Every structure is written in structure tokens, then in C-alpha cells.
Amino acid sequence: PGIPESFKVLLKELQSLCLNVEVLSSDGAAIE
Amino acid sequence: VNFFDELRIGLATADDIRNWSYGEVKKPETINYRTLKPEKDGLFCEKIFGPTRDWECYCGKYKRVRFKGIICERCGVEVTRAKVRRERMGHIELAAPVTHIWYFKGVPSRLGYLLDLAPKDLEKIIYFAAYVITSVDDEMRHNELSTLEAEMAVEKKAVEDQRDADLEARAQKLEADLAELEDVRRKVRDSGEREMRQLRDRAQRELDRLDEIWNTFTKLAPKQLIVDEVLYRELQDRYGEYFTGAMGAESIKKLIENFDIDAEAESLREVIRSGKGQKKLRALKRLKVVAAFQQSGNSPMGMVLDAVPVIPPELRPMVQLDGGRFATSDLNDLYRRVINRNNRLKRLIDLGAPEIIVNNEKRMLQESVDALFDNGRRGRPVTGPGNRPLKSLSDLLKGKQGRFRQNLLGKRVDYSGRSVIVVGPQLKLHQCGLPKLMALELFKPFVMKRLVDLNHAQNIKSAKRMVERQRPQVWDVLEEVIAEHPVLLNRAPTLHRLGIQAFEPQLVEGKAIQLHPLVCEAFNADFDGDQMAVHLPLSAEAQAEARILMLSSNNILSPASGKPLAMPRLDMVTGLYYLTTLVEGATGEYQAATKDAPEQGVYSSPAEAIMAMDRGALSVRAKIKVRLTELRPPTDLEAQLFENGWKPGDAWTAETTLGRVMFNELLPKSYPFVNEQMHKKVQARIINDLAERFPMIVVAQTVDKLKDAGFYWATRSGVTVSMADVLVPPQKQEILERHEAEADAIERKYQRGALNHTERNESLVKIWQDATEEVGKALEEFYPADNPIITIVKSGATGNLTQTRTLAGMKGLVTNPKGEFIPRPIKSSFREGLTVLEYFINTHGARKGLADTALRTADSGYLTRRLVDVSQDVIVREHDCETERGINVTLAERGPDIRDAHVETSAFARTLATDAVDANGNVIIERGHDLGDPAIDALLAAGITTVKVRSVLTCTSATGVCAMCYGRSMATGKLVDIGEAVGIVAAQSIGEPGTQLTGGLPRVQELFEARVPRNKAPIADVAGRVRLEESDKFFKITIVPDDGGEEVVYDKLSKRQRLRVIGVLSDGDHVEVGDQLMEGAADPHEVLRVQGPREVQIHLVKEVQEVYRAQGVSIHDKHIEVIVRQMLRRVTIIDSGSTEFLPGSLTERAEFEAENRRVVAAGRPVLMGITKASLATDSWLSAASFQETTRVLTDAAINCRSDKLNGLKENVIIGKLIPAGTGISRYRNIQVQPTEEARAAA
Ligand SMILES: [Mg+2]
């Protein structure tokens, strides 16, 4: 199981609220 | 990939918002009213967002799936999946920059605390009611101040010249007018004097304006407001190159551009040191927001928007209903209002309009974006149809119907059914019955797979059709498919952990779920219409989790007291009670005849006895002497007979009942004999002994044999209710009427005038309660043992002596809806039937009870919710952190010269802190033993009156807890596992039996929410001797100290609080600092500050267990202690601070200790409410999900804090495997290779 639409919608909602939320591990940053 | 360790936030910069966006919307249009298609370069636009239909352009040239990653030259739409319409973010380029409402209208204002100005003044700057000064070139002004001062002196000399000129010009005219004139003249003189006075006043006002402009020009600096507007209008044209100012957001952008965070942050660290007092607090409130922007990678430039982002269309959808009418979302109207005013502003910029209309349009735009981001925050909300406020972007996130709350915590699920439950007593515990018509659909793909695997179906579609049609061939396969493929059964409300359980689905014909009778207590599910929800776990990992963790057989023991929850109740209990219970004067009885006959009631085998029973000769409940082989005898009879060899096929004689042998035949081979009537408590201790001694499968099976046998014998028990069977006590006439003679007499005392109505009203209650008691007793003296009513209650199956008393005899006194008892009781059995009045009085308490149990479930649910959301993070992270600290459990206080009643809750299933030293010092047991009864009785035998046990309370582990400190897990019955979410287990364990209370749940939620009690009973501040002076209906308690300080005195406490019983407290006694003074509830805060954390840690447990102990429930302390821990993991800071810490904040203990050392701070212990503790977290997602999403999102966004996802409630929200059970790296990344010795032959 990858990522729920219930996360993506919250991510995109917070991106639409102009809150720059970004995903990254210990070494290397991830992409949406 | 689905692997992101952490989650960082910040503030969206116009650059990043542009980088996000694929196209720019630049027309105020949604969808064409005629054709219902998206409009070009507007909202919902395919070119910028994504295609309406899957692989189809707007114009309709490219509609094939074959090609991808190409833009159509005509329209400009890219041909991909439609799902991108719920992904590809848009943007809007604002002609004038616009600030975010969150960093402005937030309390306190983040921009306001950054730039240091009043929010009422900051409002005026943003909403174009005042100019603000951005950058003053002080040097060039200072260098050329004197020339401008001289110009100002000439400009004063000019208005002075004008002033004297006009006065001179007037005076001569008035003198001339009066001279030509000479009531008629004096009036004209006065008018002239008034006019020249007005001309003087004008010159005075002008000079005042010039001097004011000079003063305000000499006093210039950045972040300075102008109210007049004409002053700035004058200061624009003259002295314009020396400074710069503006009005709106561009001004704040220009202020942020001309800003140095380091110097500002540094100065703030000095201004706090300089002026210690009230202003230090304000400077320190100002410090935190500024200090945050330094370490933050994102710049505070992004606080203002040049471009604003646009949410994916699908989350603000315009879908036509079955007819034509639109049920449009509000966001569309806000975005429309914004893009309209943006287009109009851009058109006003293109035109070259005056400043006023542009500033007004910028105010309108600002208000539109403000309303878009937060509606009904500033002044009035935006409304469309019928005066309802428009759902904003932030309104998606906030509220009970918020994204965080509603649309993330509870969802609908596929591969899942619901149905009505029926009993399935044929089924083994692990089995459950599934309705075949449900099952068929519920496993449709799984059965399709096997139907394509077999040569039943030629292709998938024919298998789908075959299973859809319900053809005869499917049924032979569906069992082959369902064979050991478990299902998760749920019964809402899902209170406790076992409220979900996995089962083997046996196919049944019908439309009902045949549940197991034992698991009904594990669901709290009656068969009174109560539905259950089946879920099919699909993954191998899920299938495993179901099979191992939560398969009903594997978890017999509740995660509460570690008592077997799946034990026999209701019928089974009376069944086994009848089965095993002994009866004198029975059939085939043991006689032991003299001279003539043999002993008769003696049988070679249980087989023989069964044959003697089935044939009319032997009664099951007869004290017969049977010779057994397969069964193990009682512990005393083990020694006296064999004491060397065992009994796999030996022989020994037992003086029992056939039923007790048929019972022991169910219990396991090596389990010894019972020879006793099987009361539900006896069953409880037996299945407990089986649970602690034997494997779990032995318990699962033996309790199932007890179920089957129990039910089989429940029938032939003869437990049936009849008007004959329900009797009345024959003295009920004598005992009741006598209790009239005492009552009526009081009336005869009242009519004369001695006793008052209220004392009479109580004495009546006493008398009729005594009357109720007399009947309550007398019933059992009369009622025979075999009586079904007596069977049902005295087995412990169900029902109480109260219910039997209110069924037969009388209900007694029943309560009013206030709580007060009605003085005239129900003087008649339900068997006799109540009089209309006696019934009508009974209705009150019953409806009150229904109204209370209606309230209880939701309150218990909320308590459960809070207790989960506080201890959501508390897992077993490591095995052992190794700490000597613990808690000292009572365990036999002075004697026998004794066992505590609450050892099982307090001591049992825990690891020992210290080596069990005694008077001699022959340490019988070392630290880290699971504390089985042997240990407890060995420590009682050893001669110690206290034992130190390791607690979560005193666990030195930073993250979660260590396995050893928690103790033996109740679910498993072994040492707790190194990933268990003991937090949620404890939470649910505490939360569930709130429904089984009546003081009660108020006291529980009051104690857990850590509030000031309803009865504020103080504690002793200092230890000393008590002396009490009785004032005018008041207690003056003074405690004379033993140490040598000031005596503790109290004055104004109510007379009906009552003193503690320690005989009773009076003058001439010595009281401890620890103990409570008066009856009621000790304030936790008071106990914490006086007796430290460890005492209040015990006090909470003691005061929150007593309610369960009173209401007949058993929770193990450790569960409470996981909450009482999560409470006391914070400190309130007094002064010093050191690293920008605030006075009267809530900071975590471990991270505070790391700062406290200060190698190159003053914090006190605090006890906070579980809601406050759940609010106080590092993970912004959880805090945002709990309450006040805006407040915490704003506070977090500025801080740019990186969420580690150490907590699991966030991992639920983001949807990654949770850090607990089977999702921790040491479990989820286990590499299992098959052994070379096994792989060799293969
Ligand atoms: Mg029910």
C-alpha cells in the first residue's frame, strides 16, 4: 500500500493553504 | 516507494507556488451554462489542471491512450489520466502583492510579533487605511537636515508674511469701514474682529501643520504609520528621495526585504536581560517567533503572496445532479471573486488609473484572498444563496466535519460486509458462521481465482459471471477458498481491543452471522438485533496478523486483569452448575449398605455410569464412587495413592458426581480433579489456572468443550420460569405489615407535632429499606436450591439477588428523577403485579436509568477517545533501559501475627525493581521476575511487608517504554513484546468498562482530566499534631508542626464535608503530610506540589481504581500507570529560561533535562489534563488532528518543524505502517531465509 488519497488530499489542501509541506527521509528528499 | 521517514513544513513562497503550478488561470469563468464544458484559462480548465474524461483533450483531436507526454497545439491540454484533476495544483498571479491572513489575524499576530506593532494598526496598514514608512536613509537626511530646516524657516517666514499681510489688509479695511460708518458699527467691528480672528486661527493651524510636518520629518524611522494621509501626500512630493513608505502588503514585503533576523533576534536576547519584569515577558513573547526564523531554511519573505495557489478542481467539484441543478462548492465563488478582482486590478494597472480606485481594488482583493483563506475571521463572512457563510479553504481543515477529523479517522472499506449476528454453539471458538450469500460476494475474487485455477471457468469473465449468477459449482470451491482464510468480525461501538477478533469463516445457509457464544462478552454483543461487520484481511501480513494476534482462540485473556474474557456465561454457567452440583436422595446414589447389600453407588468406569444414566437407573447429580483412569486426582489424593508413577492408564476411586467426571473429561488430561459445583467464579479460577499453567490452545479447546457440554446440560438442567416456579415468601404478610405498624406510628407521632416531614421522610426510607432487606434475606431461607430462579442467580450465570427480590417479594423503595427516594415503597412483587400508582412511581427510576445508560456510552466513548489520544504514542520501544527505581506495593501490611484484596491489580504480572532482601538477607528472588503466585506467597512466607516493582511511572526510557518496566502482558500471559502499543491497550482497557458504572464515570473523567475536584478537600502542607476549634457552624483546623515552623491554619470549609476516619479525627492526634484532612477528593495539583510526582502517581491509581473496585470491574494498575505517566511527563518553567524558554509554558522532561545541565534554568513538576497533554505534542499532524488546527498549523508553519512520525496517529493519517506491533523496523524488515539443512534435500 503506497499512500492514501486521504493523505494526498490533506497534502494538496495544506499546499492550497500555502503551508509548504515537503517529504524527506534521513538521506535524500522525496517527491509528491 | 511509500517510504518517507520524516515530514517537514514551512511557508509557501511565490517561487515554490509557481514551481508547483502547471498553468496560470487568467479569466473569471468556471463552466459554460449551455454545453457544460470547462472554460479556457479559467477555473476547472483542462489546459492548466487536467482532462475531464480519461485520455481526452478539450477540443477533441487527441482522444487515444496510445500516446502520452504531448501537448495538443490547438487547445494546449496534455493527454493523461483524469485523476490528475485531483493532484495538479494551480496558481493566480496577484497584480499587487497580498499578505496571508494566518500570519496577520492570528492571536498573537506572527507578522505583528515579527515587525513589532499593534494588530489594530497592522490592520490599517494591510486594509489601506494608513501609509507605513519602509526604509529611512537617516545619514543623507542628517547630512542635509539644516538646509531643509532653513527652507522650513523660510516656509514659516512665508506663512508669517501672509498672516501679517492679511491681518494688516483686514485691519485697514475694518478701520476704513468704521471711519466711513461714523449696535450697527460695533456689530461690524465684532464681525471684522471674528473674521481676522478666523484668519489668525487659519495661519495658526497652517503654522501648526508645518511645525507638525517638520517634527514628524525630524522623527522618522522604519515601521511608522501615518493616519492623516495629506501629511504623507505633502511628504511624497517634497523630501521624497530621503525616505520611502507604502500602504498594503507590498509595504510589509518591503519591510521584510529591509530586515536582518540575526541582529533583531540578538537585540531581543539583550532587551530581555536589560529590563527584567513585565516588558521582559513581552520581549520574550516577541523572541520565540523571531528566533524560529533564524534556524528555518525557508525565509520569512514567503509570508506575503505575489501569487496564490489554487486547490485541485476535484476537491471543489461542480457536478450536475440527476436533473440539471448545480450543488456547487463555495471555494469556486471565492476563487471567482479573487480572479475577478485580480483581472479588474490588472485592467486598472493596464488603464493607468488613479491611486484611490487601485488601493480600493487592492483592499477588495486583500479582503477576497483573506475571505478565501479564512471566511468569517475578519468582520463579516462572504455569503451567496440565502445568508449562509461560504466554506473557505481553512473550513475544509477546521471543525468536526474537518479533513483531519472526519475524512481521515473513519472511512468506508472494500472486501467487507455487515450482517445480524445469531448464536453458533456447534462452532469451535476460532470458527464463525458466515451467510453463504454474503460469503460468495465477500470472497468473490478469491473464489474467482480458484474457479480459473480449476477448469470450472474458461476465462476470468465466465468465473465472474458464474459467481455473480450463484451456480452450483461455486459451493464445492468456496470452502476450498475459505479454508483457513480468516475474517475480522467487529461490533460497533468498538470499545476494547477484543471488540475486533479474527475467525475461520464456516459457510452457513441463511442471511445471519453465526457468532460463537463465548466471544459475545468480547464484543459486548447481545443477539437483540445487534449487527456485526465482517472484514476480509487480503495481504499475507494481514492474514497472519489476524491468525496470530487477534484470532479469538489466541486471546482468551482480556487486556484488563488478564482474566479469561472468553469464559462460559448465561446458559453454559447454569448448564455446568446443574451438571457438576451434588444432590442428596438421588438415583444410583452411594449408600454403603450394612450386613445385607453392597454399597450400590459404585461403578467400574465413567462409561458404566453413562450407560447407568442413559438407561433409567442413575441420576447425574448423585454422590457416586467411580473408578477413573484417564483423569488426574485431587492434589491430596495424588500423594496418598501413587506418589511415584503417573496415570496414563492406571486406576483410582473418586467419590464424586457422574457430572463432575463428565466435566473433568472436558478439562485437559494432566489437569487435576475438581470435585465441586461449577460456580462462574470457580469456572473463572479454573480457566485462570488453565490459562497460567497450560498453553492458550488447551484453554481455547477446554472452554469450548465446557461451552458444548454446558449448553447440552443447560437443556436437561430444567431451568424454566412459571407462576408456580416464581414463589412468594409466606412471612411477607407478617414482616411487611409489622413494618407498617412502625411507620403509621410515626404518623401518630407527626399528627401530635414532634418530628418534621424531612426526618420522617428519611426514617420511612430506613424502615422500608430494612423491610426490603428482611424480604431479601427471608426469600433465600424459603426458596429451594433446584428452583430455576435460584439456579440462574446462585450459579452466577446472570441476574442478582436484587432482581430476584424485585421479581419475587417486592421492588421496595424506587427513586425519583432528582435522586431522592419516595417514602411510600412498592409493597408488592412483580409476580403479584404493581398497582397503577406503585408502577407510575417505579417508571421514574427506570426511565432515569435508561436516560443515564443512554448518556453513559457516549461519555465513556469520549473518555476512551481522550485516553487513546493522550497515550497514542506509548509503545514498548526497547526490552530493558535498566533502572533500580520502581514503586513500593503494600502486599500484606503487618501480619499474620494476611493477603491484600487488590494484589492481582497492584503487584501481579509485573517485574521486580530490587532484589527481595529480608531481615536475614537470603534474597529469595532477584529483580526482574514476572510475579506469579509462587513469588507472592514465597515473599509472604519470607517475611517482608512491602515489595518494590518496576513501573512505566518510573521507566528511564526516552521514547515509549522498555518491556521489563511494563511487566508480563495480560493478552499473551508472558513478558510484554518489544513493539506492543501498551498505551492504546491501556487506554481501551480503562475506556471500555465506563458503560458498567453508575462518583462513577464523572469521578474517572474528573481524575483523568486532572481538574480541581467538586469537593475540594485540602491535604496537610506540613506534618504535625491536629487541633480543631468549632466556630459558628465552621471548623478551624490548626496543625502544630513537629519540625519547627509556622502552623497550617484553615477557616472557611463547609460543615458537611466531614473529617477523615483515622477512630475519627478530633483534638489530640498527630497527622502525616501525606494524608487527606476531610472526606471527598484530594486536589491532585495540591498532592503533586507537596509530595512530589511518585506520591500523586500512586494517588491517581488508588483514586481511579477504587471506582472500578466499587463498581465490580478489575483493571491492572500498569494500564492506569501508562496514562498517569503520560500526565506527569511535563514541567512548568518559573524563571531563567536559558534557551528562549517561556515562564509558565509546558516543556517535556527528557529534553528539559538535556538543557538543564547548561555545561557553560528553573522548572517545577506540573500535572496537566489528558486533553492538554494530547494538545502538547511535537508532531504537528496529531496536534492539528486533535483540536484548533489553525492555531497549531500557524504556530508550526512559522517554526518549520520536521515531524519524525515517532507517534503512530500521524502514521495512520499519512497512511504508512504504524510504529507498533508489526510495523517497527526490527519486525517489518526481518530477513527469513530457509535453513541450508532444509534446503539441501528439498
Ligand atoms: Mg443489547
Ligand SMILES: [Zn+2]
Ligand atoms: Zn486537443
Ligand SMILES: [Zn+2]
Ligand atoms: Zn526500564
